A paper describes a structure:
The bacteriophage T7, Escherichia coli podophage, has been employed as a model for the investigation of the DNA packaging and delivery mechanism among tailed phages and related dsDNA viruses. The tail, connected to a unique vertex of the head by the dodecameric portal gp8, consists of the dodecameric adaptor protein gp11 and the hexameric nozzle protein gp12 (20, 24) surrounded by six trimeric tail fibers gp17 (16, 22, 24). The core is formed by the core proteins gp14, gp15, and gp16; upon virion adsorption onto host membranes or the receptor rough lipopolysaccharide (LPS), these core proteins have been suggested to extend the tail channel and form a trans-envelope channel for genome delivery into the infected cell. In this study, using a 300 kV cryo-electron microscopy (cryo-EM) and defocus refinement with Z-height correction, we provided improved structures of core proteins at a resolution of 3 Å, the portal–tail complex in mature T7 at a resolution of 2.7 Å, and the portal–tail complex in LPS-induced DNA-ejected T7 at a resolution of 3.5 Å.
We also reconstructed an asymmetric structure of the DNA-ejected T7 complexed with LPS at a resolution of 8.2 Å and the local structure of the portal–tail complex at a resolution of 3.5 Å. Compared with the tail structure of the mature T7, the hexameric tail nozzle of the DNA-ejected T7 undergoes conformational changes, leading to the opening of the tail channel. Hairpin A of one gp12 molecule is close to hairpin B of the adjacent gp12 molecule. By contrast, in DNA-ejected T7, hairpin A of each gp12 molecule rotates almost 90°, leading to the formation of an extended gap for the attachment of the gp14–gp6.7 complex (described below) in the tail channel. Six copies of gp14 (residues 25–143) and twelve copies of gp6.7 (residues) were resolved in the extended channel in the DNA-ejected T7. Each gp14 molecule consists of two antiparallel α-helices connected by a short loop. We resolved two conformers of gp6.7 (conformer A residues 11–41, and conformer B, residues 11–59) in DNA-ejected T7. Moreover, each short α-helix of gp6.7 binds to the turn of the two antiparallel α-helices of gp14, forming a three-helix bundle, and each long loop of gp6.7 connects the cleft between two adjacent gp14 molecules. Six copies of conformer B of gp6.7 are located outside the channel, staying in the opposite direction along the channel compared with the conformer A. Moreover, each short helix α1 binds to the distal end of the two antiparallel α-helices, forming a three-helix bundle, and helix α2 binds to the interface of two adjacent nozzle proteins of gp12 and the turn of the antiparallel α-helices of gp14. The gp14–gp6.7 complex embedded in the open nozzle extends the tail channel, with the distal end of this channel connecting to LPS.
Numbering used by the authors:
A (entry chain N): 132 to 196
B (entry chain M): 67 to 196
C (entry chain X): 67 to 131
D (entry chain K), E (entry chain L): 294 to 342
F (entry chain A): 6 to 434
G (entry chain B): 148 to 293
H (entry chain B): 6 to 98
I (entry chain B): 343 to 436
The structure:
Amino acid sequence: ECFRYWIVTKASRQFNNRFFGAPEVEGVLQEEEDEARRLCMEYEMDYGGYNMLDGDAFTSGLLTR
Amino acid sequence: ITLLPDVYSNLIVYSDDYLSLMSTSGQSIYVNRGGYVYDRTSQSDRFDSGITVNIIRLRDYDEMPECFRYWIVTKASRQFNNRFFGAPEVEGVLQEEEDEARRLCMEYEMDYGGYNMLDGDAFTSGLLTR
Amino acid sequence: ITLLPDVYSNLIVYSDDYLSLMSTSGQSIYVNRGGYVYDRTSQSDRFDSGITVNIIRLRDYDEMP
Amino acid sequence: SKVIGLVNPAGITQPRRLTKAQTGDFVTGRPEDISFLQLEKQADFTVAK
Amino acid sequence: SKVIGLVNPAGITQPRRLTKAQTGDFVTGRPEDISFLQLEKQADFTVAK
Amino acid sequence: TGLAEDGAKSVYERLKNDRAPYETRAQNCAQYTIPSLFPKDSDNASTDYQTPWQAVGARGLNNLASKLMLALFPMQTWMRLTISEYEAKQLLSDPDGLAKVDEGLSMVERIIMNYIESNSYRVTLFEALKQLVVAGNVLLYLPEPEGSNYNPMKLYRLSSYVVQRDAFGNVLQMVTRDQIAFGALPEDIRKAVEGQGGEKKADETIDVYTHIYLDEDSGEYLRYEEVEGMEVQGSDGTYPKEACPYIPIRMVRLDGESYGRSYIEEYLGDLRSLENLQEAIVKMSMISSKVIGLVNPAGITQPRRLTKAQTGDFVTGRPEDISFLQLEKQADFTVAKAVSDAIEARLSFAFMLNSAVQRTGERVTAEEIRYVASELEDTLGGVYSILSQELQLPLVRVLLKQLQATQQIPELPKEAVEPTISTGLEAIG
Amino acid sequence: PEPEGSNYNPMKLYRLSSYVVQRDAFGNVLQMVTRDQIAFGALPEDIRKAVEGQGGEKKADETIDVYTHIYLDEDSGEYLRYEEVEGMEVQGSDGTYPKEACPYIPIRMVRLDGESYGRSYIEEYLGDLRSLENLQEAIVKMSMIS
Amino acid sequence: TGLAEDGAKSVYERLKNDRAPYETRAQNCAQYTIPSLFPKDSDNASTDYQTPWQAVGARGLNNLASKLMLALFPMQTWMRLTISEYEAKQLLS
Amino acid sequence: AVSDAIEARLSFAFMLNSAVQRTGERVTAEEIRYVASELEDTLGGVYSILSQELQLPLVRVLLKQLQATQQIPELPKEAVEPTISTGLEAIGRG
């Protein structure tokens, strides 16, 4: 759902740039797209759960003792 | 929370009501294929005995914290003004109003959560044992 | 302040008056689900002997400082 | 001798991620959002001492 | 003692490339994207000590 | 028959539940201090005991045992036998009598020490001291000497043996399990177990329980050894309290507890904090000791040119594009290290780690043993005062009676045959 | 080895790989075997005739393993020593070592109960050793890039 | 002959499996202090033992053995022969 | 900083030279006893442990072999095979 919103708000911004340009609508949708992009990143870090100590390939071998 | 599969079909339904599906552990292994929960690590969408996951589930406009209701309105107010009757004067005010609305909602989130870095913390709690 | 369920139904009502419910100590557990108080941790909307929470209740324009 | 973490509400960082995450866990957030309440009486302490 | 990697969500850098990369591996990113949560109570620590 | 009515194994298994809390603590103290010293019962031959992240505990445990053994058993004579309740007739008159008995008592003491050192008692005693520090208590058993043989004293770990005490503190009953191969069994035991039934191979291991109990009828202590529920005939014997060769020694005594507690347990809650702090410091360095080149995507520089180019090769790019991921926790490192140093210094005086004079000892000296002894009293509590009194004196009593039958005793008047014993510092001079 | 006169008699050292030992929880030795691979020409004369007596031509440079097994006699607590070559006991090599005085001296630096073998002193600090290994390895490698 | 009924060949093989963890520990311990002292069974005559990245283990191992030799086995006497013909009568008579 | 700190722990455990024994150009009984005391301070009690398991049996076997080579003037076996002490008492004259 995080990405589905981002695709729509990215396509919504792309829609008025190309075909029918509304300056104020572009101004807000640019801010909204940045906010939507930020949220999809937080989803990916929450989804990934990447661990620099044990999760990674390199450091995991070092810590084993 | 536990998602139970249909014993005959053996596969769980990943409905659009499920905003987010994440594993309780660090790495999430459940994704959507064809509207059904899919274990990407296992390459199998057939589950037995159910799974334990973390789900964000959609609610109505009601059945929501009051502090969040004004933020939902304030954000929706901005878009509604933007889409139909875009007036720069009211648009600037609502942007300031939305920023305050988000500030209060985060203030609600910390108040509701009551998160403790010493004892509520997963890692630090084990360290404090003496 | 305590919220008492109906004796037969064993359900508490999350009325529109209640502006917020939070647990006394921390990590508030009671949330609204279908208009009734729901305990997300225990996954049960049926309570007995009541619950103790911190309630913000609506007041008129008067009765305010 | 009291720890209070002052989370800036305008910030992106959320304590739920920080507390649930294990050691060495990548968490989405910004360091300036997290701050700690401190006693500012440095000048008063040195005169009193 | 606990290590938490605070990744700026607006940043280019993604934790997946950081973890999977071996030692001495070029990874697309920016240093300012990645930060670590630190306990800033220094005045409190020195007065309490 | 009193306590022996249930048997030797039934009472032993019944008393395991009380021993279990002490075993859990002893394992915890080992985990932070030389984990190989007290191993878990399940673990065997493939354990690969993990070293603790902090090294203060392993260093401190060795230091305490080394310092104790120096004071507990110096190279010089540490036992003095004195005569009382008849010295009135011996001190006032008969100058020649005092000189004769003093030489005779000196003869017993030196012979006693030659038996200690020639029989390798010291090497076993040092092992007990290390086990006393990490574990609650140890049982030391002195088997009878037969003819001219080298018979090391047998130490039993806390897991191997059990002992029961009341609130008064005297020993009610104690049971010991011992694992011996069938081929290694003595003649008496092997013939009895064969009479039980079946054929036992040499490698086969069986358990023997030696129950020492206080019968209600008399104050004597009776001991019997049983194999698979049947007692061997030659094991039965009656020993007095003072002469029992089964010596349970507790370092830290608590009223109402049959077992002592380890010295380290009071600091175990502190080594736990030190280990966690040192664990993070090394793990932070492991993150730091990793090279990741963060290439700025908006930059011109491309890593393909940098890697393919030889040394001193002109490559198109900009220096700001290339950057390296670094651990930012500089402030957290110094606060964690600062607390760790404070804990280490706190543990340093607790474990007698820092002592300038004690560091350099060229030879054993009479005053040095006293100086080592005094420090064990100023700090560390009164373990020397108590543990040695529970250790040194019973060893002198039990060994004296065992050797007295074997050794020849000259004509000694009245109490000279059984002199009062002083141990520790009070026998040095 | 036995003095065998005034001839030079060096001590023979067996690495843990070469030999084997079995012990009880009592700490005493039940049985123990040492493996020795020696060239046919270098075989002792008693071993040489036994290999020749066994049958089959052997090249001089070819090495034949020899096993010396000492075990407790179940009837009497006395060590019994014999050597076998190619699964055949050497004739006349059998001997009864005096009780608890066999020339083999199995040595364990660290003694653990219920364990037939012993553990090194390094394994107590092997972890701090390997952690230093990882840190110094990265320090050198970073200097290589620079 | 129960212990030797299988022969030294078989008894060596089964009991060798017991020491398999111990030779693994020695090889791992040697790998970090000095790879030459305890070499594996497979490698021979072409081993090229890589040096440890830290020399503390190598420096310590040689020092530890030397210190033991000086105290345990010096040129001076290191066994004492104490004569007791009787437990107490030897000095008396 | 961490690697140097780890080196300190290993240096003490392995008794890395701190002029404790490197100083001096002669070997004396006093220095041997100094090392013997040091070997008990660290390393647990391996100096004692090896004394029982290595130093003691090695003397016993050679005592038997040397008994055949040199006939002890005193016939009794106790004089022939005296009790053996291999501890710190052996170091030094007595």
